[PDB]
């Protein structure tokens, strides 16, 4: 065949830390369908927002928003435990159906997005050009986000170990752990990946007695 219908830009959702995670790649032939399981970013989360994005940038905010919806009634559970199946399906007429379903509770929500939505030919070409012109910056942002998400979880896991250990943790040690938690917290707000990893290292270096308990 010398012609066919494709979806012209990647399609996906926003995931933890402000990144676009792709479910259908640019230039995929239509009709097509893809599903992927996701989970919750923090402990006890009862809801997620599925923000539907079109484009090639790694920052969710730099992509075209096609719509959004919430899924709620998830039983509050530890981060990473809920199994939320997200499905993008584009039919032969370019209509995009997105659904999210929480496996445990069975709760599901969906939206339908018309084929005329999204970026036009000029904006499609500008998106591919802008993505390439910013390829290194976007790679650096993705790595930063990965590191931030790891430190964010190290803040939460460490703090709970402090709780559980209670009196079994020497006051000297709680002191040093507390200050390193605050320094990690501050670093996570910045954009320097090595600074964050360094505060993670400093925190490990005062958590050894906590490690053993």
């Amino acid at each position: 065949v010398l012609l066919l219908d494709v979806t012209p830009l990647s399609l996906g959702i926003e995931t933890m830390g402000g990144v676009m995670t792709t479910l259908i790649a640019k230039n995929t032939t239509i009709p097509t369908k893809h599903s992927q399981v996701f989970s919750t970013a923090e402990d006890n989360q009862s809801a997620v927002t599925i923000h539907v994005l079109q484009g090639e940038r790694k920052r969710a905010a730099d992509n075209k928003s096609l719509g959004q919806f919430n899924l709620d009634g998830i039983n509050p559970a530890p981060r990473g435990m809920p199994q939320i199946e997200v499905t993008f399906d584009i039919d032969a007429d370019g209509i995009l159906h997105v659904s999210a379903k929480d496996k445990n509770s069975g709760k599901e929500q969906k939206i339908t997005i018309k084929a005329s939505s999204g970026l036009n030919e000029d904006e499609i070409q500008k998106m591919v050009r802008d993505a390439e012109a910013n390829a290194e910056a976007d790679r650096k942002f993705e790595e930063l986000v990965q590191t931030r998400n790891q430190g964010d979880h190290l803040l939460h896991s460490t703090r709970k170990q402090v709780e559980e250990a209670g009196d079994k943790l020497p006051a000297d040690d709680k002191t040093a752990i507390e200050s390193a938690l605050t320094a990690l917290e501050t670093a996570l707000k910045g954009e320097d990946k090595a600074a964050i990893e360094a505060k993670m290292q400093e925190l490990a270096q005062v958590s050894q007695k906590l490690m053993e308990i």
Partner: peptide, 7 residues
């Protein structure tokens, strides 16, 4: 496995 934030 990616994670989705709350609304």
């Amino acid at each position: 496995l990616y994670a989705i934030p709350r609304p």
